Amino acid sequence: PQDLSEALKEATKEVHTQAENAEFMRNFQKGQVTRDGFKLVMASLYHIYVALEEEIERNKESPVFAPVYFPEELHRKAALEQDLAFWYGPRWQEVIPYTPAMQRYVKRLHEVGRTEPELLVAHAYTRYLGDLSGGQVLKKIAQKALDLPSSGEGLAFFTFPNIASATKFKQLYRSRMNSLEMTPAVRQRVIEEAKTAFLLNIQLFEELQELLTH
Ligand code: HEM
């Protein structure tokens, strides 16, 4: 359509369906991804979010990003730090894995942030809106289909606490995506970054399945 949000949802529809069928996300819902596998996901999110969120911070203030900047509602870095300390312990920072597929993903994020910040909005949409779309049904699959000790920790990533309703927030985020000012050339690229974004996730899933199978 002519609304960026709707353009994004339509384009990335097939790649998105590829992830629905990925071997890793099927076991990750069939409720049987090992505690090892879960921790690799969390570790993956951390590195990604750290990247996404440095570059968002670098580009906040810029017309290409300002309008979709909601730091309090969306930031995930602290939430993942809390979680990783529970999953990996007090020295999580030194022990967490950092694989080729995570770095791939993280590489693109710094590139876009540093040279094509006008595309950063493609990664925000894919990350935030999708994560917000699943942090609910997923968190259950997780916890119940996971452990945990009588913890009270380890699943904070799945709650955006400064967002009372995900629905009301998405709508406002899309709204704000739609008044993003953009050349038709840039817009086509942002669209194509949304696909690249999904692809980076897919390659990440395929890598984590490799590591978790032998
Ligand atoms: C088997 C794997 C997946 C399943 C089963 C799944 C499921 C869903 C479903 C049912 C929705 C509808 C939104 C809603 O519930 O209200 C959704 C939305 C969404 N998904 Fe996924 N998803 C998967 C993988 C992914 C991945 C890997 C990404 C990218 C990292 C992604 C990105 C998004 C985004 C950005 C939205 C909403 C954005 C918008 O409204 O335009 N999905 N997902």
UniProtKB/Swiss-Prot annotation:
Listed EC numbers: 1.14.14.18
Induction info: Heme oxygenase 1 activity is highly inducible by its substrate heme and by various non-heme substances such as heavy metals, bromobenzene, endotoxin, oxidizing agents and UVA.
Binding-site residues, heme b: K9, H16, Y125, R174
Residues exposed to the Cytoplasmic side: 1-214
Subcellular location: Endoplasmic reticulum membrane
Post-translational modification: A soluble form arises by proteolytic removal of the membrane anchor.
Notes on the domains: The transmembrane domain is necessary for its oligomerization.
Assembly mode: (Microbial infection) Interacts with SARS-CoV-2 ORF3A protein; the interaction promotes ORF3A-induced autophagy but is unlikely to be involved in ORF3A-mediated induction of reticulophagy.
Family: Belongs to the heme oxygenase family.
Protein name: Heme oxygenase 1
Organism: Homo sapiens (Human)
